[PDB]
Amino acid sequence: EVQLVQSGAEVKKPGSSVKVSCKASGGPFSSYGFSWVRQAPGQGLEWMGGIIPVYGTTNYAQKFQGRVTITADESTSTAYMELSSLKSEDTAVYYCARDLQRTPMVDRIIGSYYYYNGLDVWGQGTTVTVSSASTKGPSVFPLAPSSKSTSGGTAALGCLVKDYFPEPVTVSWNSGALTSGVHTFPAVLQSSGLYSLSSVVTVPSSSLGTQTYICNVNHKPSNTKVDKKVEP
Amino acid sequence: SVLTQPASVSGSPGQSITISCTGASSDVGDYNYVSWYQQHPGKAPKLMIYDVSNRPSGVSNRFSGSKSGDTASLTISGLQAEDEADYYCSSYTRSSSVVFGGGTKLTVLGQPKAAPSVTLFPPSSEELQANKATLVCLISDFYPGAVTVAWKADSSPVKAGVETTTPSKQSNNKYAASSYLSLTPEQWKSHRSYSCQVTHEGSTVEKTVAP
């Protein structure tokens, strides 16, 4: 079968542009229509444009006319989508998807010609985050456990990862040793444009004051690595 | 041209269900390039129906499509738990060259309820030394993923500085969410206590911290 391989994730400031590649790692490429569909988080699918490489023709949705450009490379079997004048509303997952049937033979080719039977082969998607915030390392604060070592049952402790950008961050406990009861929550996007999340472990109360608990926060975009010891 | 789709449909296992695209059928002598897609979270859409009554190889015969007038319909027979996903319809017109519908979230009912396990943390001493304060309220293991959070300080509701995430499915088919309350160190120790109330399906669980 056919596989569509897309480029990695992208982060852009507003007003800039982004170009996503779509490598058709299979047979079809030449006589097949390729479409570019984006999907905002928690929203519906939106088609931006399509291209037929053999005919050198493109068709763009009226919403993206003027700032979208879809090109093809017949040699390497690769498709491209370039979106300029990026706005924060363009933050979405961008997919490239081939059509299901070979294009029909068109003797009189319209420059905007395109066909659509159905997109059966899709790529893995490319996340494009359009913000205006700058890269910032997070401040890591402990979340001290409420209960004591004699209160019985289980206790909860964690770490607060505040005011960082961009995603993602990774939080381990005891250098990857403590993996049970760990619940790292999805980050929140504040009005300032920075993210904030928390990760917590549900530990036996009798282990408080006996087992050392350390959270390992790693934010690669800012080269920030913080080891914070959480104590009662 | 816009294709309208029900925002949500719900059925039980064994039940049959019909979603309905109610957009493009236009342009009388032109043909109907109508198609349907299924999309699970974090994965690419999957072509289930095209060409409106046709179905590609490998797709279960429980899915079928039809169209009457300006309304197309996707019928799913013998609902299974794996069918719970998002569904979209599409259509090619001369005017607009494809239009993906708004989408329909299909829910497979019958699953048991689950009250949320809530943990609330006071601000650290290390954070207060930096002249900042943040309350961490963590919501875990509730079913389904619909919940709302209200913060209070000594029975008085507070709106300023509340940042709440959207629910997300865990690895155990239950959902999780977190809420953050930002405060100055004066507002934290001047008040008597702070509470995070998590109301889920009318049942409210509460936790309280104090300096």
Ligand SMILES: *[C@@H]1O[C@H](CO)[C@@H](O[C@@H]2O[C@H](CO)[C@@H](O[C@@H]3O[C@H](CO)[C@@H](O)[C@H](O)[C@@H]3O)[C@H](O)[C@H]2NC(C)=O)[C@H](O)[C@H]1NC(C)=O
């Ligand atoms: C005949 O015409 C076609 C256009 O229909 C020419 O194709 C073009 O081929 C060049 C390479 O020969 C492609 O350039 C490449 O661009 C990528 C970046 O996308 C770059 O990394 C490569 O190093 C290379 O420069 C070009 O994209 C491609 N254009 C299209 C529209 O497919 C072909 O070269 C022509 N051949 C002759 C003999 O005239």
